[PDB]
Structure formats: C-alpha cells, structure tokens
Amino acid sequence: DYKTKVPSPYVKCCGTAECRTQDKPEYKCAVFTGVYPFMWGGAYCFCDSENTQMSEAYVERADVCKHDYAAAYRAHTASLRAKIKVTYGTVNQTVEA
Amino acid sequence: NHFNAYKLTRPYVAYCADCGMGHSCHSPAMIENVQADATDGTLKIQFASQIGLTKTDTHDHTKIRYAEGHDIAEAARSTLKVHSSSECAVTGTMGHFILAKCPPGEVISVSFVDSKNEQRTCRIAYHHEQRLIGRERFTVRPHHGIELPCTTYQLTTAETSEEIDMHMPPDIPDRTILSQQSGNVKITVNGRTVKYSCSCGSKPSGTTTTDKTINSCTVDKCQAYVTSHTKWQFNSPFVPRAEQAERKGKVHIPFPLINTT
Amino acid sequence: IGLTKTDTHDHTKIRYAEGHDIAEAARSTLKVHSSSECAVTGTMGHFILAKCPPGEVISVSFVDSKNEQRTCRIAYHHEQRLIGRERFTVRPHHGIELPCTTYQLT
Amino acid sequence: GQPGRFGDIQSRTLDSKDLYANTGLKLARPAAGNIHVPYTQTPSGFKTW
Ligand SMILES: *[C@@H]1O[C@H](CO)[C@@H](O[C@@H]2O[C@H](CO)[C@@H](O[C@@H]3O[C@H](CO[C@H]4O[C@H](CO)[C@@H](O)[C@H](O)[C@@H]4O)[C@@H](O)[C@H](O[C@H]4O[C@H](CO)[C@@H](O)[C@H](O)[C@@H]4O)[C@@H]3O)[C@H](O)[C@H]2NC(C)=O)[C@H](O)[C@H]1NC(C)=O
Ligand SMILES: *[C]1O[C]([C][O])[C](O[C]2O[C]([C][O])[C](O3[C]4O[C]([C][O])[C]([O])[C]([O])[C@]43[O])[C]([O])[C]2[N]C([C])=O)[C]([O])[C]1[N]C([C])=O
C-alpha cells in the first residue's frame, strides 16, 4: 500500500514563490493566485490582490508494508524429490532422495 | 519511566468538518488520519491534543494536555470517549496517539470535556468494515475452538524505528492586541515576543516587546503576530509554515505491530 | 424549557408537571437517543430540534429531583436523505455547494 | 502502472531507496477561508485487490 505525505502549505502574502523540483516520486507543484486564507486570527496576512498559495505533495511507500506485501515472481521449471519405504523383510529403512 | 523524547512539544488548533453540526470551527480536536493497517480490527487514531504528559513535561497517568487561545491548559483522561456508532472502549492511551477497538460504522469521533466544563467533539468521515480472519464470520472471541495467525499492536510504550517530523509554528495572526487611541494605536500588552507590521509607511516591521505608539492611522491598517518559537509542532497540512523549512524534530511512532495468534 | 417559575431566562433548567405543581430540573441530565446517543443542537421553548443518525425510534429522557430517569419513546421512520448524487454520511472538507434547507437558531 | 489495477506501486526489493508510482495524483484550489490541500487521487489498487 502507498501513502500521501503532505507537507505544510506555505502561503506567501503579496508575493510569489518558485518551486524548485526534487528527485522524488511524482513531486507535484502547484501555485495558485487569488486566495484569502481566513484563520483563527482574523486573516493570516494583510493584502488583497497579490496573494499566492503553495501546495506540494508526493506519494511514497507506506511504513508497514515491510511485513505484509505481495510479490510477483516469474516461474520456471521445477525439480522432484521423493521419500520411499524399502521393506524387504531384512531391516526396513526410510529414504529421501 | 524516562522515555523523555518530548521536551519541546506543544499542541495546536486546526480546522475540522463538523463541530456538533454545520459550523466548522477551527477546533482543538483535529484528527490527522486513522491507520487500520493491522489485522485484528483495532484502529490507531492520531489526533490534535496529546495525552499522558502534564504542562511542564512530566509523565502522568490521568491528566491530559491541550491548547486554547495559544496558551496551555489541562484536563482529565477518565472523561474522554471514543466511538463510531456505539460507544467502544479505549484500549491504550499514550503520548499523542489514541488506540482502540470498535464496532463497525461509517464515522469515527473523539471527545473530552473542557476546563470550562464543555463537551467539545469532532467527527470525520471514515469507513471501518469488520475485516475477517479465518473462514468464519464471528464478532466475539469464543471459548472453545482453534486459533490462527494474526497481527496486532503491542502496548510497549517505548520503541523505535518509526517517526513523523516536527516543525515550529510560523507566526500567529491577531488583531486583538491592546491597540486603541482616538487617532493612534498603543503597541503592546503581552508577555512574549511580538512582530508588528503595517502599511502606513513611515516605519518598517520590527521585533518589539515593549509598548509603542504609531500615532497615525485607524486600527484597520495594522495586524500583529506572535513570533519566534519556544517549542515545536507537527507539520499538519492545515496550518502554514514559515521560511525555516526543515526537519528539526522527530518523534516515536509507538506500538509496533508483531506476529501473534 | 428555559423558564423557572418566576419569569427568567435560564439556559439550563426546565419546567415540568408533577402533582400539578411547577418543578424545576436542569439540562445537564437530558439526553436524546434513537440508534446511537443522539446529539442536540438547539433548545427553545416548547420545541426541540436535533440532528442524529437514522433509525426507527426516538427518545427523550431527563432526570427529576428524586433521581429517576423518566422517558417516553415513539415510532418514526427517519432515514438519511439524498442530496446530490453520492450517498455519504458525514460532511467532507471539500466539495460542491448545493441548495438545501436548514433551520435558523434565532 | 495502470492506476487502480494490481500493484500501481512497484518496488524491486524490500528496501531499495528508489521506487515507481502512477497513483494518478492532481491538485485543486482551496475554498474561501479554509487553509488545506485539496488533492484528487484514485484510491488504492492494492487494497482493492
Ligand atoms: C511474522 O513472521 C514472519 C516469519 O515468516 C516474519 O518474516 C520475517 O521477518 C524477518 C525480519 O525482516 C525476515 O528476516 C530478514 O529476511 C530477509 C529475507 O530472508 C532472505 O534471506 C534469508 C537468509 O537467512 C533466507 O533464509 C530467506 O530465504 C530469504 O532469502 C533477509 O534479506 C534479511 O537479511 C539479510 O541480513 C541478515 C543480517 O542482518 C542476514 O542474516 C540475511 O541472510 C540477509 O543477508 C533478514 O534475515 C524473515 O526472513 C521473515 N520471514 C520470512 C519467512 O521471510 C514477519 O516479519 C513476522 N511479522 C512481523 C510483523 O514482524
Ligand atoms: C518393516 O516392515 C513392517 C511390516 O511388518 C512395516 O510395518 C507395519 O507397518 C505399519 C505402518 O507404519 C506399522 O503401523 C504403525 O505403528 C504406528 C505407531 O504409532 C501406528 O500409529 C500406525 O498406525 C501403525 O500401526 C506396523 O506397526 C508395522 N508392523 C510391524 C512393524 O510389525 C514397517 O513399517 C517396516 N519398517 C520398520 C522400520 O519397521
């Protein structure tokens, strides 16, 4: 199973950011204009028309599947082993071969 | 006993989707997710406030910690509840994480009473269907029969090899600073560090701690901020970050799952 | 609810009839529950509105000064409505805004 | 990596530091007021299987 790690959405008021990429699985950058974040303290910043929000997220292998997982194999020819009983009156042995 | 690992950790208040009904107040009862990657049926719920540690960093059994008005307060654990459709019992309380077993349903929720004697709750959509083991469809552990292999969580409250990261609160907006005069503003009442900023352009932002006067403008021009940290927080996706984008702190994920019957 | 014998606005106490006198009792022991423990949201006068999960019954129980839990139940075929085209059970944190009809707390 | 069929995440061993994914991930603009990260994704294929 996978997981969606989402770091914090750094918001810049009356400015703009530039997201330098990362060698990572599906590092996805998105920059939005025209935001008005309204948190507990009234507004977060004080500006009206140049606000930008940065949201970044990536997809990563979950932490528990070190113990459960499916594994696909290619499957080729096999071998054969046997176990026999060899009783002929004189002492009866068992054998694997 | 010692296990300390936490000395710089502070709760937060985040946003949620229900607060009893409809009005989605930014509440102290965030739920980040519900991990259900075990096999018995239990749920490992991680929520906003943290439990087990008192105000100034000491191991407790029955007192819990939480936040209100960006200052620290406490409550009790014996008055906390978790349920989905019917009241289900908690099975373990440690640090920042809730641990329980619970019947099916389509919602999960946590609640506890406030130090102002209230009943703050929080609900969040999540589907929990009874995952079955063996070739039967039971619901309760019987007394006669056979057993089968299965994974579950262990109550060892100090164990390594899993973690989340920690950051610091960026800055806390407010307009509710003691700043009022007839044509002027009065520029603090506080006990901590503050960064002020405005747009009546004669003086830039600064890091004052004593009172000032800006003598000029009506109050709907300046907005104030709490500033640099004393402790750390969790990089929850619901509060922004400052320009210190790092991985300063990190903290145990307790209860590693192990083979059982 | 809300009215002690002498006219006042108490947010906690409730007036009822026993022995055709006028006895008080607080809201800190009033619960409603149909299929789970229901959750009240707004309490005024001679009516009570609340959200709570669907089922077949409904209940009111509050406790008197002699500490008994008098209650009454009735049958009612309440079930979850279908707004839009995806039958949820819990409001999510992002979606589409739609016309519905709710109650006002004034 | 057909998103939502068997094994939309793939790893060449238990502990390789590189991996591959085609989860079908996109982003959307938030609402008025709420600060969060609206992300649209196909749900898991493995948990489906
Ligand atoms: C429930 O119980 C199961 C048992 O079936 C547990 O599975 C075991 O988990 C351990 C922990 O990782 C596994 O141990 C590791 O196994 C890897 C795979 O084993 C290969 O190599 C061994 C050599 O001993 C062969 O026998 C086997 O056929 C495989 O080819 C190894 O790669 C790991 O080790 C490397 O380093 C160590 C030294 O550190 C060397 O000794 C190894 O040789 C190797 O070079 C490590 O040994 C174990 O294999 C798992 N069992 C099985 C059958 O695979 C589950 O983990 C448990 N549940 C939970 C939740 O823990
Ligand atoms: C040798 O030879 C013989 C013949 O005789 C044989 O045998 C027989 O066989 C059988 C089978 O196995 C046996 O049996 C046994 O025992 C057991 C114990 O436990 C049981 O369980 C079973 O059931 C059975 O019975 C018999 O015994 C015999 N007989 C005699 C011996 O007599 C054998 O096998 C051979 N081998 C050897 C080693 O002996």
Q: What is the DSSP string of B95-131?
A: TTEEEE----EEEEEEEE--TTS---EEEEEEEE---
Assigned token pair, B13: 């208040």
State which amino acid sits at residue C79.
E
**CB atoms < 10 A from the CB of D3, how many?**
15
Smallest CA–CA distance, residue B123 to chain A, in Å, is: 20
How many angstroms separate the Cα of C49 from the Cα of each of B19, B112, C79? 16, 24, 16
Query: Which of C88, C82, C78 minimizes the C-alpha distance to C32?
Result: C78
Strands B80-83 and B105-112, bridge-based pairing: antiparallel
Which one of A8, A37, A46 has the shortest CB-CB distance to B223? A46
For the four alpha carbons of B23, B29, B32 and B37, in that order, the dihedral sign comes to negative
- The minimum-distance atom of ligand 1 relative to the CA of B258 is 60
Between CA B114 and CA B260 the distance in angstroms is: 39
A95 alpha carbon, closest ligand: 2
Please tell me the distance between residue D13's alpha carbon and the centre of ligand 1 in angstroms.
13
B128 and C CB contact within 8 Å: no
Residue B50 in contact with residue B11, Cβ under 8 Å? yes
N-term to C-term CA, chain B: 29
Q: Other C-beta atoms within 10 Å of A26: how many? A: 14
Q: A16 burial class (0-12, 13-18, 19+ CB within 10 angstroms)?
A: exposed
DSSP state of C27: G
3-state secondary structure at position B249: strand
Closest Cα to residue C60, out of C11, C16, C6? C16
Residue type, A4: T
CB contact under 8 A, D35 and A69: no
Structure tokens at A51: 């606000």
Determine whether the shortest distance from the Cβ of B205 to ligand 1 is under 6 A: no
Provide the token pair at B26. 């930014």
Query: For chain B, where are the E strands, in sequence order?
Result: 31-35, 43-47, 51-53, 59-68, 71-76, 80-83, 87-88, 90-94, 97-100, 105-112, 121-128, 150-153, 163-167, 172-174, 194-197, 223-226, 233-234, 249-252, 257-260
- Residue A75: alpha-carbon gap to chain centroid: 27
φ/ψ of residue B239, rounded to 5: -125, 135
Question: How many angstroms separate the alpha carbon of residue B37 from the centre of ligand 1?
Answer: 20
Biggest CA-to-CA distance, chain B: 83
Neighbouring residues of A74: CB distance < 8 A, sequence distance ≥ 6: none
**Chains A and C physically touch (3 or more Cβ atom pairs below 8 Å):** no
Nearest CA to B227 out of B172, B176, B166, B168 is that of B172
Contact A8 B237 (CB under 8 A): yes
Q: Which helix (H) or strand (E) holds A58?
A: strand A52-61
C-alpha C12: how far from its chain's center?
14
Q: Spell out which residues line ligand 2, taking CB within 6 angstroms.
A: A 87, 92
Distance CA B81, CA B231 (A): 28
- Give the D window 5-44 contacts with C, CB below 8 Å: 28, 30-31, 34, 36, 38
Report the distance separating Cα D44 and Cα D6, nearest Å: 9
Tokens of B255: 């209860």
CA B204 to chain centre: 35
Tell me which chain B residues have a C-beta less than 8 angstroms from the C-beta of D44: none
How many residues are listed for chain A in this entry?
A: 97
Under DSSP, is residue A13 helix (H, G, I), strand (E, B) or coil? coil
Q: Write the single-letter amino acid at B243.
A: E
Among D13, D14, D15, which residue has the most ligand 1 atoms within 8 Å of its CB, making it the best to mutate? D14
- Cα(D15) to ligand 1 centroid in Å equals 12
What's the rounded Cα separation, in Å, for the pair C51 and C36? Answer: 11
> Touching check for A40 and chain D: CB below 8 Å?
no
Q: Which residue in A49, A47, A52 sits closest to A29, CA to CA? A: A52
Q: Residues C41-65, buried b or exposed e (16+ Cβ, 10 A)?
A: bebeeeeeeeebbeeeebeeebbee
> Burial level of A32, CB count in 10 A (0-12/13-18/19+)?
middle
Closest CA to B147 of B132, B159, B133: B133
Give dist(CA B203, CA B197) in Å, integer: 9
Sign of the dihedral through C-alpha A42, A47, A50, A55: negative
Pick the residue from chain A with its C-alpha nearest to D32. Answer: A36
Which two structure tokens, joined as six digits, stand for B256? 């590693």
Q: How far apart are the first and last CA of chain A?
A: 42
For residue D38, give how far its alpha carbon lies from the nearest alpha carbon of chain A (Å): 9
With beta carbons less than 8 A apart as the criterion, state whether B192 and B231 touch. no
Q: Please indicate whether residue B259, judged by its CB atom, sits closer than 6 Å to ligand 1.
A: yes
Q: Name the one residue in this structure whose structure tokens are 């960064």.
A: B195
- Residue B50: both structure tokens together: 């943290």
Resolution of this entry, Å: 4.4
Of B167, B175, B253, the CB nearest to A42: B175
Q: How far apart are CA B29 and CA A82, in angstroms?
A: 64
Question: Using CA atoms, how far apart are residues C2 and C25, in angstroms rounded to an integer?
Answer: 10
Beta strands of chain C (E only): which ranges?
13-18, 21-26, 39-44, 47-51, 57-61, 71-75
Residues of D in contact with B238 (CB under 8 A): 35-36
Which experimental approach was used here?
cryo-EM
Which DSSP category does B8 fall into?
T
Nearest to B241 by CA among C31, A7, A51: A7
Encoded tokens for B66:
């939480």
Q: CA-CA distance, C2 to B245, in Å (whole number)?
A: 53
